[PDB]
């Protein structure tokens, strides 16, 4: 039996991962194949040939007929190796050619050797032979015959390649086997159907499976993970989180009767949050006595990367208000249809540097800055409020502030005075803006946004880079680009309607419709780049820490923790500020004691008074000179905080060429 799963399977490692219970199969007899090398071999295979020949060749290959390649030096070193110390010449050889090879001190002057060598072919001796002009189909079709295949080139696909000569001449089954490529040559070979072709994270397995299901879809023996669990029976990495989707529906129980309105889906919630919140297939009220969402459905919608319905397939942004064109108040969860892993660590996060998250104007900030401040998984704090900079704060240290500065833009438009008249002039009864008038307002908004805000933002962000590594919210995309912001640029959105948020909140300090107009100004000020689903940051923020305590937990607080920070020598006249903080098991921090923390230099200015009831502290300022810190310099196995202020354990202080120092116990 041979089934196929949508993930890279190695025999020694994916057993340690388990990798089959991760799709949802309860489970010896299950022997794993090593399909690690075929993916890199496929990547080397694709750059020369086309796609379809390579894929349609690899499809027709069984993974039980065990075989191997053979690679030989082309012609001159082939005859030279037979000339050399081994006389291991096969019996297919020419009777005259082996006789001329068994002699000593052959050279160019030998006409009798050279005349026969210039008419000698490799295909005379070795058959079947893969040359460079052969199709990829006939390579595998000839490979499925005779347990060894002779080649000429490296660029082959299939089994392992072994070499014939030394490099100086060149230029075990069980009953159930899993793999990552569906075979067709056996009437019985199977493919699992858990996840679709849209959530496969390898980008070569995805390209393979789309082409397989494009043409061979009728003849695939298809099974589900429940049927796999029927057929079977009768170090620990972080940043790999199982995800599922919630198939729910909104119900409207008025009094007695209930109705069903929509049939929604919520694409990539993590499984650990669903386990720790303890939710099941039942009904739920998702509103409080006020009408706010009750602090767990809010977190579920802030973890996902999508929310659509199932009858049509358009994006569904839910209503956060309580005005009833469409109020979502009751939820009935009905199942979980796909399950796979995901690498939570993104691509853009390479060097340790501050995080600029771009949210729109009416997104929920006042709730998430309350919730993220109140999380603690271990003896650390994940994201305190003192490390978070609002989008508001950058334009407030100014002669009358940027909101009030563009509040008086009305002086300059003909027929416009008394700001309510401007807000009546721009928006109609629909509160959708007119096409020209919003741009006519924007052509006066824009020099106030660029020539007045951006130098102050550049100065403020230099100051914020100096006094620690923080997280900075931002309204628009270009607000972090016209000001030369240094850090990771994150474009985010929430699954909610940000517009009707702007009419719920009172105490807005100005026109309540004016801030909706100002939100439209920022929405048009930004560039045309696609934002990336706030759950893409929130899973990074929460889910590695929550997975950490299941295996770091109660080992010892002294020797699971360690911290990185800048170190000044003791010889000073009147020191260790922290940079990150790392919590890991014992072997990982023992592997962190090496990888020396030199080749990283700053210039610490350290002068302040004691400020709070905690012990002696001076809020220093470190400015990194050299390169910033890579993450693979730390680990893949050790979680670390992202934001930190600067302080050390009276007198004064000056510019100190600091260095780092890994301390632990």
């Amino acid at each position: 039996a041979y089934i196929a799963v949508p993930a890279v399977v190695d025999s020694r490692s994916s057993e340690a991962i388990g990798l089959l219970e991760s799709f949802g199969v309860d489970a010896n007899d299950v022997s794993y194949q090593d399909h690690d090398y075929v993916v890199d071999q496929l990547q080397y295979m694709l750059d020369g040939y086309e796609a379809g020949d390579v894929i349609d060749a690899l499809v027709y290959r069984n993974w039980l007929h065990h075989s191997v390649y053979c690679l030989l030096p082309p012609k001159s070193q082939l005859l030279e190796y037979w000339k050399s110390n081994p006389s291991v010449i096969p019996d297919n050889v020419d009777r005259r050619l082996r006789k001329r090879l068994m002699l000593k001190k052959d050279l160019r002057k030998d006409d009798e050797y050279n005349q026969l060598a210039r008419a000698f072919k490799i295909s005379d001796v070795y058959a079947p032979l893969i040359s460079s002009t052969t199709s990829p189909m006939t390579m595998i079709q000839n490979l499925n015959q005779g347990e060894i295949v002779y080649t000429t080139t490296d660029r082959v696909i299939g089994a392992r390649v072994l070499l014939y000569a030394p490099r100086k001449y060149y230029a075990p089954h069980s009953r159930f086997n899993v793999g990552t490529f569906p075979s067709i040559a056996t009437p019985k070979c199977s493919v699992m159907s858990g996840v679709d072709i849209e959530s496969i994270p390898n980008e070569f397995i995805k390209l393979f499976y789309q082409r397989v299901k494009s043409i061979h879809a009728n003849i695939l023996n298809d099974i589900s993970p429940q049927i796999v669990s029927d057929m079977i029976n009768r170090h620990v990495d972080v940043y790999r989180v199982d995800v599922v989707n919630v198939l729910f529906e909104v119900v409207d129980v008025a009094d007695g009767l209930r109705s069903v309105s929509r049939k929604l889906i919520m694409h990539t919630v993590p499984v650990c949050i669903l386990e720790l919140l303890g939710i099941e297939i039942a009904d739920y009220c998702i509103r409080q006595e006020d009408g706010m969402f009750t602090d767990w459905f809010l977190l579920l919608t802030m973890l996902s990367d999508g929310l659509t319905d199932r009858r049509t397939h358009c994006q569904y942004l839910i209503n956060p208000s309580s005005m009833p064109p469409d109020v979502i108040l009751n939820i009935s969860i009905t199942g979980f249809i796909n399950r796979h892993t995901i690498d939570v660590m993104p691509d853009v996060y390479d060097f340790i540097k501050p995080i600029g998250a771009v949210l729109p104007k009416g997104s929920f900030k006042s709730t998430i800055m309350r919730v993220l401040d109140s999380i603690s998984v271990l003896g650390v704090k994940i994201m305190p409020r003192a490390h978070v900079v609002d989008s508001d704060e950058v334009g407030e240290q100014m002669e009358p502030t940027f909101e009030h500065a563009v509040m008086e833009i009305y002086k300059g438009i003909a027929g416009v005075d008394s700001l309510d008249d401007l807000t009546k002039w721009v928006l109609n009864s629909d509160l959708v803006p007119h096409d020209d008038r919003l741009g006519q307002l924007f052509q006066a908004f824009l020099p106030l946004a660029k020539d007045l805000l951006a130098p102050m933002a550049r100065q403020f962000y230099d100051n914020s880079m100096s006094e620690g590594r923080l997280l900075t919210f931002a309204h628009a995309d270009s607000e972090l680009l016209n000001a030369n912001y240094f850090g990771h640029l994150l474009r985010l959105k929430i699954p909610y309607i940000t517009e009707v948020n702007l009419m719920i909140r009172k105490n807005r300090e100005g026109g309540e419709l004016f801030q909706l107009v100002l939100s439209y100004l920022y929405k048009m000020y930004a560039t045309s780049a696609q934002p990336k689903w706030f759950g893409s940051l929130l899973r990074l923020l929460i889910c590695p820490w929550l997975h950490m305590e299941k295996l770091i937990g109660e080992a010892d607080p002294a020797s699971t923790s360690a911290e990185i920070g800048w170190h000044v020598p003791r010889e000073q006249l009147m020191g260790f500020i922290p940079y990150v903080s790392i919590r890991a098991p014992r072997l990982v921090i023992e592997e962190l004691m090496e990888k020396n923390w030199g080749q990283y230099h700053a210039q610490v200015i350290v002068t302040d008074q004691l400020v709070v009831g905690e012990p002696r502290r001076v809020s220093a300022k470190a400015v990194i000179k050299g390169n910033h810190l890579p993450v693979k310099l730390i680990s893949r196995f050790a979680c670390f905080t992202l934001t930190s202020k600067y302080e050390m354990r009276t007198g004064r202080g000056a510019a100190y060429n600091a260095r780092l120092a890994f301390r632990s116990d």
């Binding site: 379809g52 349609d56 027709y60 199709s135 189909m137 006939t138 079709q141 000839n142 067709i184 040559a185 056996t186 009437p187 159907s193 299901k213 494009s214 043409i215 061979h216 879809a217 009728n218 003849i219 298809d222 429940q226 049927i227 029927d230 409207d252 007695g256 009767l257 209930r258 109705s259 069903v260 309105s261 199932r310 009858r311 049509t312 358009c314 209503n319 208000s321 005005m323 009833p324 064109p325 469409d326 009864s429 629909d430 509160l431 959708v432 309607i497 517009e499 009707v500 009419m503």
Partner: protein, 1061 residues
């Protein structure tokens, strides 16, 4: 309106367009044409084929006073096939007990009727309906049609043979019970076999079960073909749904019509190869497999028409196809480049160093080889498969740039290049371009008469593109004077005599592959040149064919030109002799390319052409005949004003299709002058080695499967749109009692978008089905194609529309729905609002005939267009006016249309509701069709319907109405004391087919409406004289019949047809 503008904003947010095809699609058309995916045809169902589940509503009174708890089977935890409840109804739910491979993403899932089922009927066209409840009553027919389409498309499965087990209880006579898989399967057997239950009581279930036939349970027929193998098909008695059984029987009939066994697969892959590779198929008793691939001819032709309509005047969709066939010819062709043969042969041309001109060295600069010259030759070789949509011409830059005198030597070589390159292209004006190329170069040297002052002799030869820019002096050679233009008189006869001759080559396998060509017969391809099959397989250089003759006579014309007496004394003798030697050698160059084009290229075009993602599309080639040059190949996709016949509406409602593409003339004649063979080539070894990896794929077998769905969805579209619009095709309409609006072209286009989206949601498709037809006017659609010659004579092809399965099954489901509208949550007729106060226990879904009235009832006032209400003055009664011009008070029996109430739903409520509640008038509101709730009530207590019916009357809107609420009493099994109940809304027709049984585990029903187990459904059990196959399907659905269960396997083609390498 501060809070109200938020509602307006959200209601203008939620009306976003569902279709965003505003961007261009011609980057996706190319990928679809080069590689279209297969649909998913065969899917297996291991459960039991049903769609109706019997749901309980009100639980039974399992403790009571008049009967002990030891009577009921529920006290002993005995599992029963039916819910032991007080009221049981039938609701509709597709694919419960269905362990499918994967779902079609279709579902008609319904709540029980005590809940609200309005969300199924506001799905389609209610963009502008505000409330959560309520739907537009002018959308009901389109909503029901989409619901029936989903209901059909959710049942397209094949039944699977799971496995049996003989029982050990004495409940049956040792019968063989089915075992169906799943996580929890020990409770399906009570549901699946009603007659297996023991009979303790005189409860209604036990009165039904013990009054049936015993030997109709489990297995009764199998086909055992081999020892120790799966049985291929069985026939089983179990709970089923005869509509679903009918749908899956028709689907199995279609897939059994598509079936082939590997013997003709062997024969077809031999005939397509033309013997150059052979394959095998075994000779043994079969294991009864199912490989659906053989389709008809018209299904292939229709998809060919749709693809030709896709490539419309674009030349960037069809360019990668010719570029693909270039690489595919390059893979298996034996010919190769040899660029050095001209540079070798021009090393022995006798000339003098003293001269300034050099005829030996001018050709090598004019005709430089660069090894990328077959990339422009194999495209011209591949363009012979398509003259209808592709017309390969010579590039503009390959012409001598405003004339060029014949005294010049470089332009004289430039003439030779074009004269060799022009017969290869499929452009019909190639001979007149070849003639005018010389006639441009001879201006003031030799003159011939023209047609006008515009297309003169000096008019550029590339400007002759239309087949009647041909000069009269070209088709009458006598008009060219033999003594004042003798060389043009020569070249005209050379064109009229030695131009190549078209032929035909016979590709294709007509049996398995449906032939795709139109305007040519099947199993034939047309070539521009002549071919002769070779007798030898060790080929060698010969000089007797049309291309070598053409090269020789162009060289001899240039020899007569250099030997002309007006042209020679302008030169010296050492230059004339060198040019004559160069021409005499260039005639006798030794290249294999004219022999290859004669003998081997027509074989390997026919080898390739069936195995091709876009099949050949040709109109007839012709040399030199002006009257048979084809213009305007054109497809249609719609009719016009009132002409409903395609042969009449074809000539004025088409779209001309086709492109020219440009190739250079240098690279074709480098290929023609320079080409050689391998050293020891033997053709029956070379082609047998080359063709063998090509014929292990199955992509053409996937395209044959896609053409089924591409022809099927068109007839599905026509049949479904004809139920709401006025088309020309003869269809059968059933849903006229359901009201709808007068649909426009925008409504028809939107409904057709929903049709093909639901069509490609099932079958697992991801690109571009039926949008070429969808882009304009889906009401009147038709498919045809035509071209004409120059003389106005038109050929045309109107392919017939073959049999469709989904379009038949939708009409079958509508025929059932006409008699079982109740099960899908729809009522028929209209309601009568009036105060009825009594203690009786009749049900409002079956009212007594004393309370209803119609238009034929004497003394009933009818209200129409005219709704004018006069108020009351000084105590007189207010009045409303009749249709006949009378003026009546607010009393009696009235008849409204629903739209009259909807247009005046505020002004009528204040005037009428206080009179309906307490006074003495009763209003009949004509609707035709409506959904309904069911609020039950305990019949021992008081019950007023006014809070329900006032909430129904106040939610009526010019857009929508909510579902109609009723009040049905709860039946009991012992005597109860009666309390007065007031109800206002009753029905008119019978409306109580949805009820299954009342007091299921009880001896009798005394008070309230009763209904026993319906004997007319379970016909096979209760009637001992009926055959087991019999279904009375257009009237009732019977919920139990024999179903066949297959165990066929679907292997790939290469698992049975090997190929012998």
């Amino acid at each position: 309106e501060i809070q109200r503008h938020i509602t307006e904003f959200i209601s203008s947010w939620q009306n976003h367009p569902i279709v965003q095809v505003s961007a261009d699609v011609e980057n996706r058309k190319t990928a679809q044409l080069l590689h279209a995916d297969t649909p998913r045809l065969v899917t297996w169902d291991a459960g039991l084929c049903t769609s109706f589940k019997i749901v309980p509503i009100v639980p039974a009174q399992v403790p009571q006073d008049v009967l002990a708890y030891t009577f009921f089977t529920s006290s002993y935890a005995i599992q029963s096939p039916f819910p032991e409840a007080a009221v049981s109804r039938i609701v509709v739910h597709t694919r419960w007990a269905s362990n499918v491979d994967f779902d079609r993403d279709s579902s008609v899932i319904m709540a029980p009727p005590t809940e609200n089922n309005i969300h199924l009927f506001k799905q389609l066209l209610n963009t502008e309906t505000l409330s959560v409840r309520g739907a537009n009553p002018l959308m009901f027919r389109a909503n029901v049609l989409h619901m029936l389409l989903e209901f059909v498309l959710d049942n397209l499965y094949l039944n699977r043979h799971t496995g049996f087990s003989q029982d050990h209880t004495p409940f049956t006579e040792g019968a063989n019970l089915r075992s169906l898989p799943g996580p929890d399967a020990e409770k399906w057997y009570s549901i699946m076999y009603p007659t297996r239950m023991g009979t303790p009581n005189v409860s209604k279930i036990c009165n039904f079960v013990a009054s049936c036939v015993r030997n109709r349970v489990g297995r009764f027929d199998r086909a055992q073909m081999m020892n120790g193998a799966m049985s291929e098909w069985v026939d089983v008695f179990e709970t089923s749904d005869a509509l679903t059984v009918s749908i899956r029987g028709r689907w199995m009939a279609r897939l059994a019509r598509m079936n082939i066994n590997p013997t003709e697969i062997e024969w077809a892959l031999t005939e397509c190869a033309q013997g150059y590779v052979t394959v095998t198929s075994p000779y043994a008793p079969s294991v009864n497999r199912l490989m659906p691939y053989r389709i008809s001819n018209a299904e292939r032709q229709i998809s060919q028409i749709i693809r030709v309509m896709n490539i419309g005047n674009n030349a960037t969709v069809i360019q990668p196809v010719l570029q693909d066939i270039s690489v595919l010819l390059q893979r298996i062709s034996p010919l190769q480049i040899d660029p050095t043969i001209i540079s070798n042969t021009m090393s022995t041309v006798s000339e003098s160093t003293t001269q300034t001109l050099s005829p030996a060295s001018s050709i090598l600069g004019k005709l430089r080889p660069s090894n990328s010259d077959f990339s422009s030759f194999r495209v011209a070789l591949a363009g012979w498969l398509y003259n209808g949509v592709v017309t390969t011409v010579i590039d503009d830059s390959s012409y001598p740039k405003d004339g060029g005198s014949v005294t010049s030597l470089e332009n004289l070589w430039d003439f030779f290049i074009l004269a060799l390159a022009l017969p290869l292209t499929t452009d019909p004006c190639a001979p007149v371009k070849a003639f005018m190329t010389l006639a441009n170069m001879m201006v003031g040297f030799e003159t011939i008469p023209m047609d006008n002052q515009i297309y003169t002799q000096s008019r550029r030869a590339s400007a002759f593109s239309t087949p009647h820019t041909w000069p009269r002096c070209f088709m009458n050679i006598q008009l060219i004077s033999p003594i004042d233009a003798p060389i043009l008189r020569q070249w005209a006869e050379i064109i009229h005599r030695y131009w190549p001759n078209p032929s035909q080559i016979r590709y294709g396998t007509p049996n398995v592959f449906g032939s795709a060509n139109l305007f040519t017969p099947p199993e034939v391809l047309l070539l521009p040149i002549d071919h002769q099959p070779a007798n030898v397989t060790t080929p060698t250089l010969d000089f007797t064919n049309e291309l070598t003759n053409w090269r020789a006579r162009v060289c001899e014309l240039m020899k007569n030109l250099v030997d002309n007496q007006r042209y020679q004394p302008g030169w010296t003798q050492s230059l004339v002799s060198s040019m004559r030697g160069t021409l005499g050698k260039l005639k006798l160059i030794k290249s294999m390319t004219p022999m290859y084009l004669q003998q081997l290229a027509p074989v390997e075009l026919a080898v390739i052409a069936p195995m091709l993602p876009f099949p050949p599309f040709q109109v007839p080639y012709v040399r030199l005949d002006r009257d048979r040059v084809p213009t305007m190949v054109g497809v249609t996709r719609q009719s016009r004003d009132t002409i409903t016949q395609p042969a009449l509406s074809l000539s004025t409602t088409n779209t001309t299709v086709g492109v020219p593409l440009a190739l250079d003339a240098r690279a074709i004649t480098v290929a023609l002058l320079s080409g050689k063979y391998p050293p020891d080539l033997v053709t029956n070894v070379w082609y047998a080695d080359a063709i063998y990896p090509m014929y292990a794929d199955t992509e053409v077998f996937s395209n044959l499967q896609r053409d089924v769905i591409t022809c099927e969805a068109v007839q599905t579209l026509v049949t479904l749109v004809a139920q709401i619009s006025e088309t020309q095709y003869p269809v059968d309409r059933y849903l006229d009692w359901i009201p709808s609006l007068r649909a426009s072209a925008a409504t028809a286009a939107t409904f057709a978008e929903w049709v093909n989206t639901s069509m490609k949601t099932a079958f697992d498709l991801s690109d571009m089905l039926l949008e070429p037809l969808l882009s304009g006017d889906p009401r009147m659609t038709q498919l045809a194609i035509q071209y004409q010659q120059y003389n106005g004579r038109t050929f045309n092809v109107i392919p017939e529309m073959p049999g469709s399965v989904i379009a038949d099954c939708v009409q079958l489901t509508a025929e059932v729905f006409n008699h079982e509208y109740n099960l899908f949550g729809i009522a028929r007729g209209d309601i009568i609002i009036g105060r009825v106060q009594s203690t009786h226990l009749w049900s409002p879904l079956a009212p007594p005939p004393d309370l209803v009235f119609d238009r034929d009832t004497p003394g009933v006032h009818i209200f129409g267009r005219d709704c004018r209400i006069s108020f009351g003055m000084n105590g007189a009664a207010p009045m409303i006016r009749d249709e006949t011009g009378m003026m009546v008070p607010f009393e009696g029996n009235w008849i409204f249309p629903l739209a009259l109430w909807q247009m005046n739903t505020r002004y009528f409520n204040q005037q009428f509701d206080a009179w309906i509640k307490t006074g003495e008038l009763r209003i009949r509101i004509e609707m035709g069709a409506y959904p309904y709730m069911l609020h039950y009530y305990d019949p021992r207590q008081y019950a007023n319907a006014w809070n329900l019916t006032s909430a129904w009357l106040e939610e009526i809107t010019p857009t929508s109405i909510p579902s109609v609420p009723f009040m049905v009493p709860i039946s009991s099994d012992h005597d109860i004391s009666s309390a007065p109940a007031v109800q206002y809304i009753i029905s008119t027709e019978y409306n109580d087919r949805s009820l299954f049984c009342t007091n299921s585990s009880s001896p009798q029903t005394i008070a309230g409406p009763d209904k026993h187990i319906p004997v007319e459904r379970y016909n096979i059990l209760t009637n001992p004289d009926a055959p087991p196959t019999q279904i009375q399907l257009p009237e009732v659905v019977d919920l139990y019949n024999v179903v066949t269960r297959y165990a066929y396997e679907t292997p790939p083609i290469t698992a049975v047809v090997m190929g012998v390498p």
